[PDB]
Amino acid sequence: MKEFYLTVEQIGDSIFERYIDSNGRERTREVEYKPSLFAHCPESQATKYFDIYGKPCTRKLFANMRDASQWIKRMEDIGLEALGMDDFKLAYLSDTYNYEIKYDHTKIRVANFDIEVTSPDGFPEPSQAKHPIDAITHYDSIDDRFYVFDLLNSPYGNVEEWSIEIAAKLQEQGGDEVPSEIIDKIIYMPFDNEKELLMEYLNFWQQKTPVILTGWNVESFAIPYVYNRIKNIFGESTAKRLSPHRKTRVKVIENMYGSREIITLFGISVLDYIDLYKKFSFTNQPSYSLDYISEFELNVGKLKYDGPISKLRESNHQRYISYNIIAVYRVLQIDAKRQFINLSLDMGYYAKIQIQSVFSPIKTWDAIIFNSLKEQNKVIPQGRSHPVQPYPGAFVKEPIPNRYKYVMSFDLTSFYPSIIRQVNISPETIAGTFKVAPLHDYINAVAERPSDVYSCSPNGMMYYKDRDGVVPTEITKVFNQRKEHKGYMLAAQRNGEIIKEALHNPNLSVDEPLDVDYRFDFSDEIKEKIKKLSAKSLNEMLFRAQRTEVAGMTAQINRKLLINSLYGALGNVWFRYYDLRNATAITTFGQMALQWIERKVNEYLNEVCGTEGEAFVLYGDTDSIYVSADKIIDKVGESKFRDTNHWVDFLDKFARERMEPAIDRGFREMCEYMNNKQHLMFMDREAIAGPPLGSKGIGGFWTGKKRYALNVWDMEGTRYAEPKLKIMGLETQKSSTPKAVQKALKECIRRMLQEGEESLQEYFKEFEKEFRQLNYISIASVSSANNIAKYDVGGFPGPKCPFHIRGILTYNRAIKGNIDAPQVVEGEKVYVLPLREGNPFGDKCIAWPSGTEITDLIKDDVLHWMDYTVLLEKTFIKPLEGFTSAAKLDYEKKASLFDMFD
DNA sequence: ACAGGTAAGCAGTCCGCG
DNA sequence: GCGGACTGCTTACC
Ligand SMILES: Cc1cn([C@H]2C[C@H](O)[C@@H](COP(=O)(O)OP(=O)(O)OP(=O)(O)O)O2)c(=O)[nH]c1=O
Ligand SMILES: [Ca+2]
Ligand SMILES: [Ca+2]
Ligand SMILES: [Ca+2]
Ligand SMILES: [Ca+2]
Ligand SMILES: [Ca+2]
Ligand SMILES: [Ca+2]
Ligand code: NA
Ligand code: NA
Ligand code: NA
């Protein structure tokens, strides 16, 4: 097989690499890499190398990387550009691996670990590591085993070995319900003293050193705590054994009081799953505890336990260890579903960067753009500094608040990247400029044609229509990657719906879940089968379908992020190729395109419909349009429509056969107008929304920009079995909204769009009535806690002090002294509840770390002093008053002029 | 340092108000 | 007292 790298580091004049050799084994080598840089030179000295702008350059080879470094400063001290890849690590990879990398993931050692640290004080700061490490569960992907290290003797209590048969038993049987599929994979190792455990762990690590190291929060707690614990005991040179090269870096960020550290283990790629989750999951959770996340992702128990975690070890060491093993498996289960590690490897090896670099799109693209240029024997420009500076983005139509029974939406495929490709925007494809007319003249096709020669943007830029650009080239490649995965995804979604309608005719029997590749649309033979299967087999398929979908989603939504981030990069001063001319060429062309098609779509429906001057496009954002379909339906009337499914099928057909064709002609013209390289402005139907036939449901409404809700029946060709709401911007979608309120608000909306005014009213009267019975946590608000101290002003709120921040301050006063209660971590999120006039806390509200139930010290008090009336008005009614006001309804039946009969 | 702009809602502060 | 203009903060849509 082809050789591929594992980890790479630059240490002095040496580049340490861990790789998998031609045979398939893991090796490690030191290399005094001879790097190269470039200097513009006289054309009289023709050569093989030229920068991206065609100017000739000379290559200088250095005896070692340090000389190449000093040469960069010298050129800087002279005032001349020093071209080429300045991060030698990348150069080394681009050099060592002159080809597309095909890697064997079963060869990459992926380790997952978690540690437990009992602590009487409070959260045991890893900068200190003053408490003993009493448990480590480490899973190795090549061994496929969980290596458990248990400390039986500690100054906080001595316990008996952990029982694997007790652990395996069910909760209901006094066991731990440790997943059966991993019981035979556990390797238990009890230790009599902490030193032996740590020492046995280090040797373990040397034999099976991780290439990729992950876990939940391992970077902020596990890794650091282990480093300083082993360091504060066996000495610092021992602590450095965690690095296959014996070199570590400690980054100190002593945020105000208390000190937090970040340890860098050279020769190792650390992918904290929490960071992988926040970047690739596309979610915004009120809490980020593995417990909360596992629940959200896997829908499993809450790992229940009696006393406080600080005493879990002594009273029930049996469960303590079982819970540590599970937390490790939990992250693994999430990964099998989300597949963020696979994504990371894919990207890392595609770009040829250290794997952990996938957290940085700028470095990811610099590597890509760099390699792609090295091929053509070109020299990348030197990174220059630029001052931060604002620039226009997308256009967003101001919508008319109101309801909208029938609405049809259209969007553009990979907009900004497409625009980049169509216009050929790239650092070296610039041709010049042109006197620009007001953007609205291009929108209205009044302005003279920009260029007859070049590709243009309404922002004034011109690019070559012939020559191709690195940016358009490399971005298109990942776009195709994005396209393949979205196809697999929508297919799996289309299958999920086929199974759902099936779960209506579950022909009783004991059957087998079919053998199918859910990425492809179900064949006719299978569709014919399913219909007979039962809930047993059917449901297993639905689960497998949805797992396949999520998998594709991950792969596609993230290739999207990456390409969209290349556009972003262009507007960020640290990007080697930063340039507001292109960034703006992009966004400006974007604004034109949307408003251009807005005009078209309007002209086309004021004609082949009738009424002229009417505005069909009611809303729009960046690259989308929501076309009111009322008239399209009126044209034919409800008559011919047998059922809901009919007009929906009618609209689909109309959008695909009529709408789009016109729209395609609309952008084909705009393309000529700008004389762009290649037409790539593809706008397809998105949603088909309306209320179920003959119902009082308004089926759709808006309150303003970025705040609407539609009753959708088809989304990009997926015809749901049951109508699915599409809500955006409203409180039901915000993580700051109490769980109970989101559920309630969404239901009020469901009723609004689907059933009617009185349906909405009924539910409102009921929710209000039982509201006070809700669970305190389900109705608490959530917010992040930044700059807690800025307004700390002595335990009491300072000027302009934010509400939630005020809540915190009050909390620290109710636990003031009790250094045993949970603290609020700067940056983390917190639950927030209002307090009625007069309370021992003495303030408007109180706030505590999210995902956790406030400690028993305060709980029963805040539970009493809670202010449901404020919670109900601020969180539920106010927002609701906004939805119905825009919908032109009332959640509460207003007294009528007829309230004198009854 | 380490993708980007656009934009809504809440809550605090200051000010004009018989 | 108390709405309204403006700002700081948070969070969602593209
Ligand atoms: C979601 C998102 C969009 N955008 C911009 C660039 C997008 O091309 C533009 C339109 O957004 P979207 O419509 O969300 O996405 P898209 O056009 O890139 O892709 P598709 O619809 O095919 O899934 O908004 C960002 O810059 N960053 C983001 O994170
Ligand atoms: Ca833990
Ligand atoms: Ca869109
Ligand atoms: Ca789009
Ligand atoms: Ca054209
Ligand atoms: Ca189309
Ligand atoms: Ca689409
Ligand atoms: Na159970
Ligand atoms: Na059936
Ligand atoms: Na007309």
- Note whether residue A899 is domain-resident: no
Q: Is residue A665 part of a domain?
A: yes
CB A321 within 8 A of CB A150: yes
C-alpha A563 to ligand 1 mean position (Å)? 10
The CATH number linked to A850 is: 3.40.1820.10
Alpha-carbon Rg for chain A in angstroms = 31
What does the buried/exposed string (b/e) look like for A496-515 if buried means 16 or more CB atoms within 10 Å of the residue's CB?
Answer: bbbbeebbeebeeeeeeebe
Atom of ligand 1 nearest to the CA of A417: 8
Residue A519 lies in a domain: yes
Resolution in A: 2.5
Phi/psi region, residue A790 (left: phi>0; alpha: psi -120 to 50; beta: rest), is alpha
Q: What one-character-per-residue DSSP string does A19-46 give?
A: EE-TTS-EEEE------EEEEE--TTS-
Q: How far is CA A132 from CA A86, A194, A226, A320, in A?
A: 43, 7, 10, 15
**Within-domain flag for A642:** yes
DSSP state of A79: T
Q: How far is the CA of A873 from the centre of ligand 7 (A)?
A: 38
CA of A657 to the centre of ligand 1 (A): 26
In this structure, the residue with its CA closest to atom 9 of ligand 1 is A415
Select from A572, A604, A622 the last residue of a domain.
A572
- A166 CA → ligand 8 middle, Å: 14
Question: Residue A218 corresponds to which tokens in the numbers above?
Answer: 């391992």
Rounded to whole angstroms, the Cα distance separating A200 from A207 reads 11
Decide: helix, strand or coil at residue A541.
helix
CB A569, CB A362: distance < 8 Å = yes
How far apart (Å, rounded) are the C-alpha atoms in residues A472 and A490?
26
Whether residues A766 and A802 fall in one domain = no
Same domain for A745 and A792?
no
- CATH number of the domain at A154, please: 3.30.420.10
C-alpha of residue A483 to centroid of ligand 7, in Å: 11
CB-CB contact of A689 with A408 (8 Å)? yes
- Is residue A694 in some structural domain? yes
Half-sphere exposure for A879 (CA within 13 Å, toward CB): 25
d(C-alpha A846, C-alpha A862), whole Å: 8
Neighbours of A848 (CB within 10 A): 26
Would residue A882 count as lying in a domain?
A: yes
SS3 assignment, position A716: coil
Cα–Cα distance for residue pair A679/A728, rounded to 1 Å: 30
Closest CA to A226 of A247, A209, A240: A240
Last residue of a domain, one of A523, A557, A572: A572
A645 with A629, same domain: the answer is yes
Q: How far apart are CA A459 and CA A589, in angstroms?
A: 7
Report which DSSP code applies to A83: B
CA atoms within 13 A on the CB side of A472: 25
What lies within 8 Å, CB to CB, of A233 at 6+ separation is A195, A198
Backbone angles phi, psi at A378, to 5 degrees: -110, 165
Structure tokens at A378: 């070109």
DSSP string, A227-267: HHHHHHHH-HHHHGGGSTTS-EEEEEE--SSS-EEEEEETT
**A464, A409 contact by CB (below 8 A):** no
Q: How many helices (H) and strands (E) does chain A have?
A: 28, 31
Q: Are A506 and A533 in contact (CB under 8 A)?
A: yes
> Which nucleotides of chain C are near protein (any atom < 7 Å from a CB)?
8-14
Q: Which residues touch strand C (CB under 7 A)?
A: A 284, 394, 621-624, 706, 727-729, 733-736, 782-787, 790, 800, 802, 804-805, 829
- Count of alpha carbons within 13 Å of A833, Cβ hemisphere only? 27
Asked if the structure places residue A897 within a domain, the reply is no
Q: Which residues contact A190 (CB under 8 A, 6 or more apart)?
A: A150, A152, A161, A162
Closest CA to A457 of A621, A586, A583: A586
For residues A136 and A193, the answer to whether their CB atoms sit within 8 Å is no
Q: How far is CA A785 from CA A450, A522, A781, A829, in A?
A: 50, 48, 13, 6
User: DSSP E strands: which ranges in A85-211?
Assistant: 110-116, 135-140, 145-151, 153-154, 157-158, 186-191
Task: Give me the CA A510–C1' C1 separation in Å, rounded.
Answer: 73
Helix residue ranges per DSSP H, A396-456:
415-423, 439-443
Q: How many CB atoms lie within 10 A of CB A843?
A: 17
Same domain, yes or no, for A788 and A833? yes
Q: Is residue A902 part of a domain?
A: no
Please give the Cα distance from A530 to A495 (Å, whole number).
11
Residue A753, domain CATH? 1.20.1280.300
- Paired with A147 in beta bridges are A138, A187
A95 and A132 assigned to the same domain: no
How far is residue A655's CA from residue A178's CA, in Å, rounded to a whole number?
53
SS3 (DSSP) at A480: helix
Q: Give me the CATH number covering residue A27.
A: 3.30.342.10
Q: Which residues, 6 or more positions from A90, have their beta carbon under 8 angstroms from its beta carbon?
A: A352, A353, A366, A367, A370
A623 Cβ inside 6 Å of ligand 1: yes
Residue A711 β-bridge partners = A725
| Same domain for A761 and A800 | no
CA–C1' A763–B8 (A): 26
Write the CB contacts of A216 (distance below 8 Å, at least 6 apart in sequence): A114, A272, A273, A274, A290, A327, A330, A331
| Total domains in the fold of chain A | 6
Atom 14 in ligand 1: residue holding the nearest Cα: A414
User: From CA A866, how far away is CA A282, in angstroms rounded?
Assistant: 33
By the CB criterion, residues less than 5 angstroms from ion ligand 6 are: A 660, 684
Whether A748 contacts A852, CB under 8 Å: no
User: Is A625 within 8 Å of A601 (Cβ atoms)?
Assistant: yes
Q: Is the dihedral of CA A187, A193, A196, A199 positive or negative?
A: positive
Same domain, yes or no: A313 and A221: yes
Structure tokens at A395: 């256009």
Are A8 and A86 members of one domain? yes
Rounded distance between C-alpha atoms, residue A494 and residue A501, angstroms: 11
**Backbone angles phi and psi of A252, in degrees to 5:** -100, 125
Q: Which nucleotide is nearest to A790 (CA to C1')?
A: C8
Q: After which residues is chain A broken (C to N over 2.5 A)?
A: none
Q: At A177, which helix (H) or strand (E)?
A: none
- Strand B contact nucleotides, protein CB < 7 Å: 1-14
Return the number of other C-beta atoms located less than 10 Å from residue A250's C-beta.
Answer: 13
Tokens of A873: 């008005």
What's the distance, CA A659 to chain centroid? 33
A233 and A125 in one domain? yes
* Residue where a domain stops, chosen among A695, A729, A763: A729
Amino acid at A475: I
CATH code at A657?
A: 3.90.1600.10
**Ligand nearest the Cα atom of residue A611:** 10
Half-sphere exposure of A132 toward its Cβ, with a 13 Å CA cutoff? 21
What is the signed CA dihedral for A203, A204, A210, A213, rounded to 10 degrees? -110
Give the closest residue to B14 (Cα–C1′). Answer: A800
Task: Give the domain CATH number at A490.
Answer: 1.10.287.690
Helix then strand then coil, in percent of chain A rounded to 5, is: 40, 20, 40
Same domain, A357 and A332: no
Are A662 and A671 spatial neighbours (Cβ–Cβ below 8 Å)? no
Please list, residue by residue across A732-769, b when 16 or more beta carbons sit within 10 angstroms of its beta carbon and e when fewer do.
Answer: beebbbbbbbbebbbbbbbbbbbbbbebbbebbeebee
Q: What is the end-to-end Cα distance of chain A in Å, rounded?
A: 86
Q: Which of A166, A163, A216 is nearest to A190 (CA)?
A: A163
Distance measured from the CA of protein residue A801 to the C1' of nucleotide C9, in angstroms: 10
Query: In the complex, which nucleotide's C1' lies nearest to the CA atom of residue A573?
Result: B1
Rounded to the nearest 10°, the torsion over CA A832, A835, A839, A844 is 80
For C14, which residue's CA is nearest its C1'? A622
- The reply to whether A612 and A721 lie within a common domain is yes
Query: A484: Cβ–Cβ under 8 A, 6 or more apart, which residues?
Result: none
A409 lines ligand 1 (CB under 6 A): no
- DSSP H helices, A376-466, are 415-423, 439-443
Residues A189-220: b if buried by 16+ CB within 10 A, e if exposed: ebbeebeebbbebbebbeebbbbbbbbbbbbb
Render A335-349 in DSSP notation, one character per residue.
HHHH-HHHHHHHHHH
Which structural domain range is residue A118 located in?
109-339
Cα distance between residue A535 and residue A732, in whole Å: 32
Distance A836 CA to C3 C1' (A): 24
Residue A169 CA to ligand 8 centre (angstroms): 10
Same structural domain for residues A457 and A483?
no
